[PDB]
Amino acid sequence: RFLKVKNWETDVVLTDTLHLKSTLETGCTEHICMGSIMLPTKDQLFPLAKEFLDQYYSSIKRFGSKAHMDRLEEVNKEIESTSTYQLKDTELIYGAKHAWRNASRCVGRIQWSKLQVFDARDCTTAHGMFNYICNHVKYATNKGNLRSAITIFPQRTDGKHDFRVWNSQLIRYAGYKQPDGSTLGDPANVQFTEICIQQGWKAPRGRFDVLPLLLQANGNDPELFQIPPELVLEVPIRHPKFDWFKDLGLKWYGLPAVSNMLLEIGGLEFSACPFSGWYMGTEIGVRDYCDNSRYNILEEVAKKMDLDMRKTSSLWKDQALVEINIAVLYSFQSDKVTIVDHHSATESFIKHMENEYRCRGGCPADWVWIVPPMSGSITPVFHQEMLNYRLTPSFEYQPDPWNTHVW
Amino acid sequence: RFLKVKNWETDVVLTDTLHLKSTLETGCTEHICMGSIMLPVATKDQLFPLAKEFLDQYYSSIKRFGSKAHMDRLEEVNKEIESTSTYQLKDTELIYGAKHAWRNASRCVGRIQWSKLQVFDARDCTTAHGMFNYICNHVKYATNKGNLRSAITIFPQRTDGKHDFRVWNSQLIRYAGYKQPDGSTLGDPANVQFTEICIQQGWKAPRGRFDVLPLLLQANGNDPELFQIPPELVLEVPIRHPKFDWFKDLGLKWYGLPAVSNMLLEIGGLEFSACPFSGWYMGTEIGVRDYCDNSRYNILEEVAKKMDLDMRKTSSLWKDQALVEINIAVLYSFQSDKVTIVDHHSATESFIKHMENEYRCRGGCPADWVWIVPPMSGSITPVFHQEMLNYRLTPSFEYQPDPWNTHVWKG
Numbered sequence: 151r152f153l154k155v156k157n158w159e160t161d162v163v164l165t166d167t168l169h170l171k172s173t174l175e176t177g178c179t180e181h182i183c184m185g186s187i188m189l190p191t192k193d194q195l196f197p198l199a200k201e202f203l204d205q206y207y208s209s210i211k212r213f214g215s216k217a218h219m220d221r222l223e224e225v226n227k228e229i230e231s232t233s234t235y236q237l238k239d240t241e242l243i244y245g246a247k248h249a250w251r252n253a254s255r256c257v258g259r260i261q262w263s264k265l266q267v268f269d270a271r272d273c274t275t276a277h278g279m280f281n282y283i284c285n286h287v288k289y290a291t292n293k294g295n296l297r298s299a300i301t302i303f304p305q306r307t308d309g310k311h312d313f314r315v316w317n318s319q320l321i322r323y324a325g326y327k328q329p330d331g332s333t334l335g336d337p338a339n340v341q342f343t344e345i346c347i348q349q350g351w352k353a354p355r356g357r358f359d360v361l362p363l364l365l366q367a368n369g370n371d372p373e374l375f376q377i378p379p380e381l382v383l384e385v386p387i388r389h390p391k392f393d394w395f396k397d398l399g400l401k402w403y404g405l406p407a408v409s410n411m412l413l414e415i416g417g418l419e420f421s422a423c424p425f426s427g428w429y430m431g432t433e434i435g436v437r438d439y440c441d442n443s444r445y446n447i448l449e450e451v452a453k454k455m456d457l458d459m460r461k462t463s464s465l466w467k468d469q470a471l472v473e474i475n476i477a478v479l480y481s482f483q484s485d486k487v488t489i490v491d492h493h494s495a496t497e498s499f500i501k502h503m504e505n506e507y508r509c510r511g512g513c514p515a516d517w518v519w520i521v522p523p524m525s526g527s528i529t530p531v532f533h534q535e536m537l538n539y540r541l542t543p544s545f546e547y548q549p550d551p552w553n554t555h556v557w
Numbered sequence: 558r559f560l561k562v563k564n565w566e567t568d569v570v571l572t573d574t575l576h577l578k579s580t581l582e583t584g585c586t587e588h589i590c591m592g593s594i595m596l597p598v599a600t601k602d603q604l605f606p607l608a609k610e611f612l613d614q615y616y617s618s619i620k621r622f623g624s625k626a627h628m629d630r631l632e633e634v635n636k637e638i639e640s641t642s643t644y645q646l647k648d649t650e651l652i653y654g655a656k657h658a659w660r661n662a663s664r665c666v667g668r669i670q671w672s673k674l675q676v677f678d679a680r681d682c683t684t685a686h687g688m689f690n691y692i693c694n695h696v697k698y699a700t701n702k703g704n705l706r707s708a709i710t711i712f713p714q715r716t717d718g719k720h721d722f723r724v725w726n727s728q729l730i731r732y733a734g735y736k737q738p739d740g741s742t743l744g745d746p747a748n749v750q751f752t753e754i755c756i757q758q759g760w761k762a763p764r765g766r767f768d769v770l771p772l773l774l775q776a777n778g779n780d781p782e783l784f785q786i787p788p789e790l791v792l793e794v795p796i797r798h799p800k801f802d803w804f805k806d807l808g809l810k811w812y813g814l815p816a817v818s819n820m821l822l823e824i825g826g827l828e829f830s831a832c833p834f835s836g837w838y839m840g841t842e843i844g845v846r847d848y849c850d851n852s853r854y855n856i857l858e859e860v861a862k863k864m865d866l867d868m869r870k871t872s873s874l875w876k877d878q879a880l881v882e883i884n885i886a887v888l889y890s891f892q893s894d895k896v897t898i899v900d901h902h903s904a905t906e907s908f909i910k911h912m913e914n915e916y917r918c919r920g921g922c923p924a925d926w927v928w929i930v931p932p933m934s935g936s937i938t939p940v941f942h943q944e945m946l947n948y949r950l951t952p953s954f955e956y957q958p959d960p961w962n963t964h965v966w967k968g
C-alpha cells in the first residue's frame with residue numbers, strides 16, 4: 151500500500167500514497183517491466199465524470215457539499231440525455247492544469263499551476279483554429295519572456311467530427327529527402343513535409359524552413375496556413391568562446407508547443423489541445439541537433455574543433471556535445487529568450503517532487519524520460535527513485551491523423 | 558504471448574518470447590512501474606522443482622534433453638535431496654550455471670562476453686585462509702598483467718543459513734574511506750562503514766586517499782578474518798590527461814580489476830553466498846560515478862577550477878565540461894598502461910549487437926534500460942534509443958544484505 155522512494159545521493163526518503171488513486175494501466179506486470187517502451191458509452195462516461203468531479207470538489211474543499219452533489223446530478227442528467235456533457239470553465243482550467251501535473255514524463259512540472267488556459271470550445275473552422283493558434287503563439291512567446299499556455303478546441307463527439315492539429319508541434323522545421331539520398335533539414339518531419347507539399351505548400355527547400363500549420367476542423371479535410379513570421383521567435387546559435395560556431399548556419403525556434411496529444415478530462419476527449427512551455431537546453435542541443443536520425447551535427451562540429459575522430463575513446467562526440475549545449479544556452483540567454491539548462495530544471499524537479507510528496511502524497515515520474523540525455527548522473531534526478539503510474543486528467547498519445555482520416 | 562521492442566533510431570523491431578520462461582517477480586504491477594527502484598533456508602518442498610527446471614535447461618543446452626543421462630541425473634538429484642535435504646552440482650552444471658547467471662544479468666551491459674567466463678570451483682574450501690588463497694589466485698588470473706580476463710570463484714553453497722561463506726567486501730579491491738571529526742571524508746566515502754569494521758577487526762589503516770582495503774572473509778559461518786592482498790597483485794593506474802599536464806598533480810589513480818564480491822549466485826535452487834566475479838571496466842564507471850558522484854570522490858569542482866571554467870552559473874555547463882575531460886583522462890591512462898578498459902560508445906554498440914543476437918538465437922534478452930544507459934552522454938549511445946524488456950531469469954545474481962547486519966558473532 152504505502153510505497154517508499156529513496157534518493158541515494160541525499161538519503162531523503164519519501165512515502166507514496168498517491169499511486170493508490172491510479173486507474174489506468176502501465177504496460178508492466180509482476181513478470182515483466184515495460185518501463186522503456188515508448189508506447190506501452192453512457193455507462194462508461196458517468197463513473198469517469200464522477201471520479202473527476204469528486205477530485206475537483208475535494209480540491210476546492212467542497213467535497214460532499216451541495217454544489218458538489220448538485221453538479222453531479224446536473225451532469226448525470228445531461229449524460230442520460232445527450233450521451234455526453236460540458237465542463238464548466240472552472241473544471242476545464244482545473245482539468246488542464248492537472249493533466250500537466252500528472253504528466254509523469256515531464257520534468258518541467260514545478261510550473262504546473264501557472265498555465266494559461268485558452269478555451270476554444272466555441273471554434274468551428276480551420277481558419278478559426280488558425281486564429282486561436284496565432285493568438286496562443288503570440289501570448290506564449292511574449293517577446294521572448296515565455297509563458298505556459300494551452301488552447302483547447304471542442305471535445306470529441308462521434309469520432310468522425312474531431313478537431314486535430316496535424317503538426318506534431320506548432321513550430322517545426324521541414325525535412326526533405328534528397329537526390330543525394332541524404333536529408334536536408336529535419337529528418338523527423340520528412341513525411342509531414344511531404345503531406346504539406348501534397349496539399350499544395352510551396353516549400354522553400356532549405357535547412358530551417360518553418361512548416362505550415364495543417365488544421366482539421368470538425369472532421370473535415372485539413373487546410374494549410376503560414377504562421378506570421380514575426381510571431382515565430384528564432385535564435386541564431388553562436389558560441390561564447392568559438393568565433394566559427396555561428397558559421398555552421400544553425401538556429402532554433404524559441405517556443406516548444408506540442409500539438410498532437412489528447413487531453414482527457416473526466417472521460418471527455420480533447421483531440422486538439424496544443425500546449426507550450428519553454429525549452430530545456432538539451433532538447434535542442436542534445437536531441438534535435440545530435441541524434442543520429444535528426445540534424446546529426448556531431449561530425450561537423452568535432453571537425454571544426456579539430457578533435458581526434460579516429461577512435462571513439464578520445465570522447466570526441468562527448469566533447470562536441472558539451473560545446474553545442476553551451477552554445478544553445480548562451481544564445482537563448484543572450485537573446486533574452488527563456489530557456490532552462492538541465493542542471494537547473496532537474497534541481498527544480500527534485501524540489502517539485504518534495505512539494506508533491508508532502509502536499510499530495512506523491513508524484514508520478516518516469517525516470518527514463520526525466521533524466522536528461524546528457525550528463526545523467528551529474529543531475530540529482532539520476533539518483534532519485536521514482537514511481538511511475540497513470541493519473542487522470544492526463545495527456546495521451548493518439549494516432550497520427552493521416553492513418554485515421556477519411557478524405 | 559509475443560512482445561515487440563523497437564530501436565527508434567534504426568527502426569529495427571525484435572520479438573521476445575523468452576520472457577514466457579520467467580518465473581520470478583519484478584516489483585512492477587499493472588498499475589505501478591518500479592523500474593527505477595534500486596531494490597524492488599529452502600526445503601525439499603521447493604528444492605526439487607527448482608533443481609528440475611535447471612537440469613532441464615542444462616540438458617537442453619547440451620542437446621541431451623530426455624536422454625538416459627538426463628533422466629538418471631534427475632533421479633540421482635531427487636534421491637540426494639530426499640536423503641540430504643540438498644544436492645551437489647556437477648562441475649559442468651556449475652560452469653553452465655555461472656555463465657547463465659551473467660547472461661541473465663539484465664543490468665549488465667558487458668554481457669556480449671558471457672560465454673567466456675573462467676570458472677574457479679572453490680567448493681572444497683573450508684577456512685578463511687583457504688578463501689584468501691582462492692581469491693589471490695582469482696585476482697592474479699583475472700589481472701593477467703593488464704590483459705584482464707573475466708572470472709568467478711565459487712565458494713560452498715548455503716546449507717542451513719548458519720554456516721554461510723561470505724566476502725564482507727563489496728568489491729575485492731576498493732579504497733578505504735575515513736570520516737574525519739570536521740565531517741569531511743578522506744578517500745572513498747562509499748566505503749566508510751566497511752572501513753570502520755576493518756579497523757575494529759584490527760586493520761592498521763594508513764589513512765590515505767587511496768588505501769586498498771584488506772579482505773574480510775567469513776568461512777562456514779565463522780567470524781570473518783582480515784587479510785592483506787599482496788600489493789604486487791593489485792594493478793593500479795595513475796590517472797593523467799593527454800593534453801592537460803596539471804591533471805597528474807590531482808593525485809588520482811584507480812585499480813584495474815572491477816570484482817563484485819557481495820552478490821548471491823542462485824543455480825537450480827542452490828545459493829552460493831560467496832561468488833566474487835570480475836571483468837574489466839567501462840570508463841564511465843570510474844570517470845563518471847567513482848570520481849564525480851557528489852557522494853564519492855567528488856572531483857568536479859577541483860577539475861573545473863584547474864580548467865579555469867566559468868563556475869558562476871550552471872548554464873556555462875562547467876560540470877559537463879570537466880566531466881568529459883576526466884573521462885578522457887581515465888581512458889587515456891588505462892590504454893597507455895595497456896590495462897583493458899572499454900569506453901561507453903564501444904560497450905553500448907557491442908551490447909546492441911549482443912542483444913540482437915540473443916533475440917535471434919535465444920528468443921530474448923532481459924535488459925534494464927535504467928542501468929544499461931551510461932551515466933553520461935546517454936542519447937549519443939545506441940542503447941538510449943533501444944526499447945528493452947526487463948524480466949528475471951535463473952540462474953541469477955541477486956543482492957543480499959550486508960553481512961554485518963545479519964552475522965551472529967561467536968567471539
Ligand code: HEM
Pocket residue numbers: 250253255256257258259261265298299300425426427428429430433490495519545
Ligand atoms: C514550462 C516549461 C516546460 C519544460 C522545461 C518542459 C520539459 C519537458 C521535457 C524535457 C520533456 C521530455 C520530452 C523529451 O525529452 O522529448 C517533457 C515532456 C512532456 N511535457 Fe513538459 N515541459 C514544460 C512545460 C509543459 C507544459 C506547459 C505541458 C502541458 C501543459 C507539458 C506537458 C508535457 C507532456 C504531456 C510530456 C510527455 C510528452 C511525450 O510523452 O512525448 N510540459 N517536458
Ligand code: HEM
Pocket residue numbers: 659662664665666667668670674707708709834835836837838839842899904928954
Ligand atoms: C567483461 C566486462 C564487463 C563489463 C564492461 C561490465 C559492465 C557492467 C556495468 C557498466 C554494469 C552497471 C553497474 C554500474 O554501473 O553500477 C554492470 C553490472 C553488472 N554486471 Fe557486468 N560487466 C562486465 C563483466 C561482468 C561479469 C564477468 C559478471 C558476472 C560473471 C557481471 C555481472 C554483472 C551484474 C550481476 C551487474 C548488476 C550489478 C548490480 O545490480 O549492482 N558483469 N556490469
Ligand SMILES: Cc1cc(N)nc(C[C@H]2CNC[C@@H]2NCCNCCc2cccc(F)c2)c1
Pocket residue numbers: 188189258406407408425426427428429430433547
Ligand atoms: C510543452 C513542452 C515543453 C518542452 N520544453 N518540451 C516538451 C517536450 C516535447 C519537445 N521535444 C520533444 C517533446 N515532444 C515529442 C513527443 N514525442 C516524440 C518522441 C516519440 C516518437 C514516436 C513515438 C512516441 F511515442 C514518442 C513539451
Ligand SMILES: Cc1cc(N)nc(C[C@H]2CNC[C@@H]2NCCNCCc2cccc(F)c2)c1
Pocket residue numbers: 595596667815816817834835836837838839842956
Ligand atoms: C564484474 C563487473 C565488471 C564491471 N565493469 N562493472 C561491474 C559493476 C560494478 C562495478 N562498478 C559499479 C558496480 N557495482 C557497484 C555496486 N553495485 C550495487 C548497486 C547498488 C548500490 C546500493 C543499493 C543497491 F540496491 C544496489 C561489475
Ligand SMILES: C[C@H](O)[C@H](O)[C@H]1CNc2nc(N)[nH]c(=O)c2N1
Pocket residue numbers: 185186187188518519520565941942943944945
Ligand atoms: C527506447 C526509449 O524508451 C526511448 O529512447 C526514450 C528514452 N528516454 C527518453 N527521454 C526523453 N525525455 N525523451 C525521449 O524521446 C526519450 N526516448
Ligand SMILES: C[C@H](O)[C@H](O)[C@H]1CNc2nc(N)[nH]c(=O)c2N1
Pocket residue numbers: 158532533534535536592593594595927928929
Ligand atoms: C535511483 C536510480 O534507480 C539509481 O540511481 C540507478 C540509476 N541507474 C544506474 N545505472 C547504473 N549502471 N548504476 C547505477 O548505480 C545506477 N543507479
Ligand SMILES: [Zn+2]
Pocket residue numbers: 178179182183184185585589590591592
Ligand atoms: Zn515496470
